[PDB]
Ligand binder design. Structure first.
Ligand SMILES: [Zn+2]
Ligand SMILES: [Zn+2]
Lengths: 306, 306
């Protein structure tokens, strides 16, 4: 028992991190097979980032201007190309530690683990969600660009995020591994405002199920509701609307606990309207929304990887 | 910027986990050099755990009754011995993935990362603290015994915890890697009550410094206090007393921010007495106490490992 915000074991990803230097700019790259992926703004100076024309800047770079180091050993760059907002550097050596992998573009509300790196070296691992405004709330200091987010399914790593930017408000933006930004953001140092950061309702409900499974039961009430009635309350509190697809996804947690999804919605409605009155759920005084229904099933049943 | 509960990258520890089976009991072991460490209750049945005499139970086991599997490959056990509450199984092969390591016994308030494992396979990684009552609040399901907690300093893994027990209240107890329990707990299925779980004051203060560094400033007030005056309030709220040693440890955070430690104590005193009034700090509605002062310096400056 117990319930923790848990990241995926990071070993398979640690073996893929390298340092990429272009001129005086160093950040992280991801080495899979004989390709290294990194943010294209490795080619920029601090001055360039105010208004970069990446195609024109890239004309001035050749393979030998990209310095790639894996541990203490230099890799030879034999080609380079730009795809959307990422650079692909072809090297002459396949990474011997390449895991089974795929590239996925996730949806808001999905969770993943981030391996924060500096100078190609892993610093730490944590779990976060893609927010509904397509930002993440991470922990990234200068030098962390090119750190990646991932999920693992048994032995296959699904890479879903590469870190590129901190907005002036201190939240984070980045791309999938095809180089397309999540959200409307661009890799330029300009004013970019994020939209409303709504709470991910289906994740809150999953976490309430986890709470019941682990013995935190005080918030269960005598009421039920309907989807439409619940969504009227959700909208008032800047919660995402719940759909029947979400209800279907929570089915296994409902069956395990015997608490109908709409009954749990009515418990959540009363927590929104009355508050927590100074009590906690699973050690939180807020309603937690960075566990998906699959995260809860996984942690509550003990799924493993290798 | 941003501030996250972050675990150490787990790769160096993933390479050390194995499955140990004795009879019908399977749990995790730690393979370092040519020794595998596991909880001694691997030799028990469910019935035995009510009142085990481990020396008498162990007389009935020989090397070949201990089945050790690393991945898909069986290891040959050539000796076994019991040290306190751990079994040491000598194998005929040194783990080729053995990292630089040490065994440390930590103090309450210290934080470490847990690699939760089942059947020798890593499931997830999370960060926790040793509570002042010598329990941890983990996420452990049946089969997770023998999972370990660790800290990393550059390239050296310091192992500090091995998981053995869940108390009837749902909190967790275990040993250092010499097999000595943290706290008064024993490896028997009997009623064992935990003492007061007080809040780790020096960790709260460190986290308030992290909040200031990252721009959460609303709780800073116009007051100061003294150690003795603060400790009178701390005792009333089941906070650990603050000592000059703690003040000394917070010195670098005080110097960086320009906020004297006793001034921060006075801010904390007003948060304890008045509450948060519905606001948050670093995304929490509680006062967080599982970051040490070293955790904060580390994360706020970007220290790496390899
Ligand atoms: Zn950057
Ligand atoms: Zn056990």
């Amino acid at each position: 028992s117990g319930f923790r915000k848990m990241a995926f074991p990071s070993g398979k990803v640690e073996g893929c991190m390298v340092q990429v230097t272009c001129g005086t700019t160093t950040l992280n790259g991801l080495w899979l097979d004989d390709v290294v992926y990194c943010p294209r703004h490795v080619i920029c100076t601090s001055e360039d980032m105010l208004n970069p024309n990446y195609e024109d800047l890239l004309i001035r770079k050749s393979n030998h201007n990209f310095l790639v180091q894996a541990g203490n050993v230099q890799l030879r760059v034999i080609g380079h190309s730009m795809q959307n907002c990422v650079l692909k550097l072809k090297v002459d050596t396949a990474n011997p530690k390449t895991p089974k992998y795929k590239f996925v573009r996730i949806q808001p509300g999905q969770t993943f683990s981030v391996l924060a790196c500096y100078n190609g070296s892993p610093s730490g691992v944590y779990q976060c969600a893609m927010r509904p405004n397509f930002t993440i709330k991470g922990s990234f200091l200068n030098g962390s660009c090119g750190s990646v987010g991932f999920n693992i399914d048994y032995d296959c790593v699904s890479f879903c995020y590469m870190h590129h930017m901190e907005l002036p408000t201190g939240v984070h933006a980045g791309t999938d591994l095809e180089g397309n930004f999540y959200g409307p953001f661009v890799d330029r140092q300009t004013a970019q405002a994020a939209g409303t950061d709504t709470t991910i309702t289906v994740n809150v409900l999953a976490w309430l199920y986890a709470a019941v499974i682990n013995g935190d039961r005080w918030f269960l009430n005598r009421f039920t509701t309907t989807l439409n009635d619940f969504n009227l309350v959700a909208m008032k509190y800047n919660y995402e609307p719940l759909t029947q697809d979400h209800v279907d996804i929570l089915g296994p947690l409902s069956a395990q606990t015997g608490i109908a999804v709409l009954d749990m919605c009515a418990s959540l409605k009363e927590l929104l309207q009355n508050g927590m009155n100074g009590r906690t759920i699973l050690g939180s005084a807020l309603l937690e929304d960075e566990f998906t229904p699959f995260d809860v099933v996984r942690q509550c049943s003990g799924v493993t990887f290798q």
